Amino acid sequence: MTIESIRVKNLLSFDDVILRDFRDINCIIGRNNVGKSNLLKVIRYFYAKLENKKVIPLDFHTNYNAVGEITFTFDTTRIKKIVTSRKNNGRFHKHIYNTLFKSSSVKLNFEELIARKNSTNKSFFSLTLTICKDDSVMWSVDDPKVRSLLATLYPFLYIETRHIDLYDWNPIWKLISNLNSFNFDDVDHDELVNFLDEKISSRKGDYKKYIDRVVSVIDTKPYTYKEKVINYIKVAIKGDSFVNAGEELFTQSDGTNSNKFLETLLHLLITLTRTEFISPIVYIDEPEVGLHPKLAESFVSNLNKIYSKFKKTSELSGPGRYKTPYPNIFYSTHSPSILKQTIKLFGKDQQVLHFSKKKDGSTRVNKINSTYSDERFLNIFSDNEARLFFSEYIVFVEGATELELFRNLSLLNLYPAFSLADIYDANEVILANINPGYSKASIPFVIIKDIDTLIDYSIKTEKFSLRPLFEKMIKELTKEFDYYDTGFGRVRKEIDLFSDIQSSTKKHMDSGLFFKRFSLHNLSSRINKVSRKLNRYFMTTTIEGALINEQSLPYFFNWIGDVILTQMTINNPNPDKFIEAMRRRYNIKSQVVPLFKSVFCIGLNHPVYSSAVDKQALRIKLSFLNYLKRKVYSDFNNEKEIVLALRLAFGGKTETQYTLDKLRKDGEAELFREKIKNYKNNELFFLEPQMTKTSGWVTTFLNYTIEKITSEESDDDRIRQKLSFIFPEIISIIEQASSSIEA
């Protein structure tokens, strides 16, 4: 490894933040203004003060602390192995020994030294920089040679891709100079000059005279090591100025230029760090800025290709594969493509860090689970799943109807806060391998399911039966296995009755369509109150039942009236004569149903008719409206039967958790099923194509309801309260999600 931990106390936006357990790739994600670049600034200042540069000290998070501390724990196990060995007697190795590992092995005795040598070596070097209130800086190690050597051994390479100079890639060479280490004693400036003069002269000695003249005229300073290696590279290679795919930089784009710059630099880093013991830490800001999603994916793919091409394992070995640890690569991204490709192509060698600024202003760093044990999920992992990492509140659902509802534009207009929550339908296995409960504190979430997934009532036996999900939930909820007393006695009682519910029996009425005295609403409320600790919300019925309740019957009926008035047309190219013929053949009163069947049919396009045709159509439509009102209020005894029939037609469930298909298969409620089929095939034929779940009736219903109620009432608080009254179920979930989002 390279760095064990980084700790910041009271500097910039950090109160007390510790980052550890670094992996080969560390993806940093988080909202805008959470401190992601503040880590960059802290590390940059620490390394600038490491080399004794003169810079302004960073600002304190709060002024009620007299200190601000930065702690770095360098991992010197591999360097200790490098230098302690008797073979490496070089001068650089001798310096590293005499600076770092001397005076540390001095204090240890023979027994402890031998124990360290023989056992699994683990040596760390902890360096703390403390900034006082008067801008003075104090180190925990008072030997500046140690700090300079630590800077040399673990160089910090740093890019903000936003401020890259696209048309001049010179800053690459400097970074290359930081990477590789070798000997320069043998190469003087005399042998090289003689070689060049012998190669460049029609008469021997001329080039040496020229260089002597230039040297005599100028006054310079001896080369530093990095300048030496840069000069030798630049002389050795064929060209200095950079060219993108055979074309000059200024003709190319900006995204292409930045992508190629980053790609070449990272490729050089990984390629050149193989043979040396220098372990850099590289920090990229926005590796995706100005890049097409395809280009960002390709950038990560090429990075992983180079990373895996030099990686040696128990199976992969041979020429060109090294065990040398890879440099610690941090990059802060706001692009789901970068994160998705990072996860999919790295697996266990990547780490996702979430930066969130809390309520007071401190930054919190958390680790989001990005390793999955399921290969199928890794292969099927796509942009939609990777988008979840950037969410603020994830509302997991089960079917597509909930997606249709919670994404409604008009509904989100009146609840802007819920616009920040991403809805994602999750299967049970997908929800299991995502592990949203691991984050919880990082990304709050809620899992929305129907109560059918818990209890399956049987009409024949008049018994509830517990699904295995209920047993598993109870098993996590019987916390009392190894605990102490707390105000959880109510929880134990609730679990006791939840286990007791199995043996109880409840009678049903109307051949199994209602409960005599059992209140499924009360059971749902108790279940939700108990299971709020598990972030799971269970609805009493299906989502169609939630939309269509006894209170929502009027507006829905109004929609029927509107769907009776506007969106059908006349099924003939000759409205006048056709309407006359159908009025003649079919009576207004006795045969209104076949007359409406023949005349009107659903059509998106509305041709304009004559005024008399409009009058006739309006009279027929009003007559049909009155007839349907009378028939509906006659064939059904109370409003509850009508609501249940509407739920069943659209695909909902009864009070006993039975669908229309389930009732047909089991054979119960023959009379109600026959009435529903009669209403579908005779009077409500035009609504038949809209009866299905995926037909999009939810969107039209919600849009019309919102528009109508906004027409009735003007104030937004009034409109929200009316929404809460009319849909007590959905508005509650939206309110809970928004309240959790606000905090």
């Binding site: 240890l108 402890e112 360096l127 190690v141 102490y484």
Partner: protein, 370 residues
């Protein structure tokens, strides 16, 4: 944005109903009478407990909930603060090579009330709550402070066990926390404080913490607002110190990392309890001999079931003690996992003891059904 409290803030969200009568009739908020405070004796120490029925207890609780929790503190204060814990107090010192520990004598009794007034003044607007008689800050301190009947000479006193006393102590000592932290930082010493126990550590090879100069300087600072150093509890050691059983060690030199481990004295009681459980000693004897919990005959609520009541009570108390120690070591394990500073072999010992505790609690619970 700092927290500010005005008349409406006191009357609406703080008082709610505790002092509605005083605010509607413009009557002065009274002192905390001796009738509302009972005087307990624990050791040589004296504790003051307020009665719950009094409105002062409720207003203290809502003061703690809504007001004292927003005033900024000093990060060197690791006690009585949201998220502060003893292990946090003992952690920054794993980087040190020499350790020193100091104590403040009677920290809560030596807090001057005028210092509390000065500390709380900037966070409370200067108004007149009750006509022109009593100011808002005066009413709030009347709620917070108390007058000791045993020692009337020193006047108003922040007593031990007054709900809001710990937060007020942290706020009033923030000044000295800043002063001492600045001094230690200029000396290159790591400083932390838990309640009144102060811990300093030097990561350099030096004898500063063992010298009399350091004690003299800290005492000179503490004399600014009248505190004193308990000379009996002063401790200074090198490369290893033990604080109430928790041992911090650092044998290394330059850039070394120490380790914190509980010692065997600390685990003696739980080991003895597990040993007695494995020896089939009756639960009553285990609870009375080691856990010092006993069922006094004056505490029995009903005489209907008494032989069963005693057995159930002792069973529950043993379960609660085992669960408490299980969660105490789970806290140690979590702290190690978050910071990686607890001894690895001690982590193995913790794992073994935790498995033993869990097995014993499982056995007791299984026997409960027999």
């Amino acid at each position: 944005k700092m927290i500010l409290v005005d008349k409406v803030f006191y009357e609406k969200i703080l008082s709610v109903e505790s002092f509605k009568e005083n605010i509607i009739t413009q009557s002065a908020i009274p002192k905390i009478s001796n009738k509302e405070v009972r005087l307990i004796s624990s050791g040589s120490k004296i504790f003051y407990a307020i009665n719950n029925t009094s409105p002062h207890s409720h207003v203290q609780l809502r003061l703690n909930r809504f007001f004292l929790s927003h005033i900024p503190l000093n990060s060197a204060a690791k006690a009585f603060v949201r998220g502060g814990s003893y292990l946090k107090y003992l952690e920054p010192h794993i980087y040190g090579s020499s350790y020193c520990r100091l104590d403040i004598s009677s920290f809560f009794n030596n807090i001057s009330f005028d210092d509390v007034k000065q500390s709380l003044s900037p966070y409370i607007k200067d108004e007149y709550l009750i006509g022109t008689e009593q100011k808002l800050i005066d009413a709030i301190l009347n709620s917070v402070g108390y007058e000791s009947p045993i020692r009337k000479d020193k006047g108003m006193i922040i007593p031990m066990g007054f709900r809001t006393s710990p937060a007020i102590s942290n706020i009033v000592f923030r000044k000295m926390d800043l002063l001492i932290q600045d001094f230690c930082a200029k000396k290159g010493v790591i400083y932390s404080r838990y309640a009144d126990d102060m811990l300093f550590s030097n990561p350099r090879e030096s004898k500063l913490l063992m010298s009399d100069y350091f004690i003299d300087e800290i005492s000179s600072l503490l004399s600014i607002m009248g505190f004193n150093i308990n000379q009996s509890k002063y401790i200074s050691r090198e490369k290893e110190i033990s604080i109430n059983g928790y041992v911090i060690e650092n044998k290394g030199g330059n850039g070394s990392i120490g380790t914190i481990r509980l010692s065997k004295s600390k685990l003696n009681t739980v080991l003895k309890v597990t040993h007695a459980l494995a020896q089939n000693i009756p639960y009553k004897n285990i609870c009375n001999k080691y856990i010092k919990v006993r069922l006094k005959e004056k505490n029995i609520k009903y005489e209907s079931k008494k032989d069963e009541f005693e057995k159930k009570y002792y069973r529950d108390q043993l379960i609660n003690y085992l669960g408490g120690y299980r969660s105490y070591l789970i806290s140690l394990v979590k702290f190690h996992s978050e910071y990686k500073c607890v001894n690895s072999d001690f982590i193995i010992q913790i794992n073994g003891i935790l498995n033993d505790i869990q097995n014993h609690i499982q056995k007791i619970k299984k026997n409960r059904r027999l």
